[PDB]
Ligand binder design. Structure first.
Ligand code: PLP
Ligand code: PLP
Lengths: 346, 346
């Protein structure tokens, strides 16, 4: 069941973790792997790479397994970094791209969001076109923290035009949650031979395995080979490898994982409509919504009430990112929000 | 319970893995983490960092947790690499240093082994002293593949002399197996404030957790801060983090892990002595010995008998590295070797 939270046992809706346990088949695989984990998972890593390759309709050399997509982002940046290069990003997006770009001494070119917190793709395209050196473009889709998608018919033709000296990193961490039919995975462009795309994926979100540390990149083999020089081989942990292989066969859990996230979303959105607090469309496992009280006060009052929400995401200073917990959790949070309103805490 | 091997179920003495399961307490920790691993192991990683800091008598900023020491070697090299830097290594050692040095575009300066396969420390010192640019020195102790130690009184005064523009990476993967009293961990030099040493350690060997991917670096905080820019945070897998925390408390297992290794070593050494095949002193969980037949023939005959031994380690072309299995495995291997001798296969 669900139990009312306290500060010692809070509802955790702070890091976009799946509030469900991983698949029972994946859990069995993970636990069974422990007795084997005195040894390296060498053959199993080969099997997982092959299975991911078939999933993306590419060959094995187009897959790089990494310890989460955290490592894929780093390797992608390191592989294509130089002191002449720029990273082109929307101003409000997932911070790892900029983090590793600054480590590489790159220019970071942030493009202001449009008036609906959408990506300004014309602005991103102009940031690349007017720069005479190499550009890395980092596109998170669906975006964190906003939750919104960028339509495929807006991204795909830009990428297909092959702007000179430009590598696109497309992070689809939250893609399996998506309901909007304008969203398409970029994967088929790689299957069809694109050499200017790195697709990053993870088992941390829909597969509910954040702590297991399994992600990967999909790209042309020449791109994967370059990225491979910035990781210490493919040496994923035994439990994560076996859990990943199992989760890939448990299509029933993946349907359930999406459906539970959909139910949670509507419970939150109901409360937000009742309170008349604007929110952005949610295509991941989180909602980004507006506040009329100071963010810091709201975070503190929620924390005292046993609920950990998202950190601040400047420059959206009056917005908060609320991850979607289980339905029972989101109802308790929705109702706390209603009680806050009565006393002006929201 | 021991059973005779087949080609489908071989004795695996090829990758210096501990042939013992992980500690029973560590396995239970690892299994119990799986239900929790929908979430990132954030606080648990902080606790493991603090526990390793206490173990090495340093503060937490002097520890960097990594996904095995493989990632530590990479990060250490990336942090200190430049196009003007050289890597100084013994000609016969663990190849990851050279590998990442080459990716960085560094000169790689290999110093021939002494006539007893020991490190030529005077040659390594001279290679640094002769080079006007920055140098990284990578010292594996006990060395892989030879298994030998370099006495502390030969290494410590070199490091303590602070050669200009030189960082020492000291890889003590196998150090808990060591019996030789001339061996000393470099750790106290970091506790005493050295800024030119990176110590790398792993849970993959004495702790028997190769497949759990947990290692770490110990260094001055300024050096750890630089290394940390080349990993995607400290985001170790949940089962590994909880297994590492438990294994650090199970001192009885560590004692047993070494003792079993010692027993296995003597079984192999007894066979080599009977066969009059020279070997090097073994201070890790493997033995480097000479062959009179071609290495490739010997590798093939052992594979066919269901025993997987080490790969070739040029330039020691007439030597093989045999990992130490359980005592019962090594008795069976030892007797297979005696039988091979009768038919000239060894
Ligand atoms: C867009 C995005 N990409 C990548 C990551 C990194 O996740 P992981 O290393 O668990 O795959 C996250 C954070 O969870 C994310 O939100
Ligand atoms: C000397 C040495 N250092 C480092 C490693 C890397 O091991 P891990 O990544 O499991 O810590 C090895 C394993 O082969 C090794 O032999």
């Amino acid at each position: 069941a669900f139990t009312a939270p306290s500060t010692d046992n809070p509802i955790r809706i702070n890091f976009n973790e799946n509030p469900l346990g991983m698949s029972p088949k994946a859990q069995a695989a993970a636990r069974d792997a422990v007795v084997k984990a005195n040894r390296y998972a060498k053959n199993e890593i080969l099997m997982l790479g092959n299975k991911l390759a078939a999933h993306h309709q590419v060959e094995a050399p187009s897959i790089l397994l990494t310890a989460g997509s955290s490592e894929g982002i780093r390797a992608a940046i390191e592989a294509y970094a130089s002191l002449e290069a720029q990273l082109v990003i929307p101003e409000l997006t997932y911070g790892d791209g900029e983090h590793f770009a600054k480590i590489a001494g790159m220019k970071v070119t942030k493009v202001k969001m449009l008036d609906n917190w959408a990506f300004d793709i014309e602005g991103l395209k102009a940031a690349v076109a007017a720069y005479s050196g190499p550009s890395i473009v980092y596109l998170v889709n669906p975006n964190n923290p906003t939750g919104t998608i960028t339509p495929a018919d807006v991204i795909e033709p830009w990428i297909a035009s092959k702007p000179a000296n430009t590598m696109f990193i497309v992070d689809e961490a939250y893609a399996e949650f998506v309901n909007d039919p304008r969203f398409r995975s970029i994967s088929p462009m790689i299957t069809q031979g694109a050499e200017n795309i790195i697709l990053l994926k993870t088992f941390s979100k829909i597969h509910a395995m954040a702590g297991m540390r399994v992600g990967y990149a999909v790209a042309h083999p020449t791109v994967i080979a370059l990225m491979g020089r910035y990781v210490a081989g493919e040496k994923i942990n035994f439990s994560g490898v076996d859990a990943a292989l199992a989760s890939m066969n448990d299509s029933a859990f993946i349907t359930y994982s999406k459906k539970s996230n959909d139910v949670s979303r509507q419970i939150l959105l109901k409360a937000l409509e009742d309170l008349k607090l604007p929110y952005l469309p949610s295509e991941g496992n989180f909602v980004f919504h507006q506040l009329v009280v100071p963010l810091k006060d709201y975070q503190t009052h929620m924390a005292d009430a046993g609920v950990l929400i998202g950190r601040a995401f400047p420059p959206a200073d009056n917005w908060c990112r609320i991850s979607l917990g289980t339905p029972q959790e989101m109802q308790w949070v929705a109702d706390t929000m209603r009680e806050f309103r009565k006393k002006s805490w929201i």
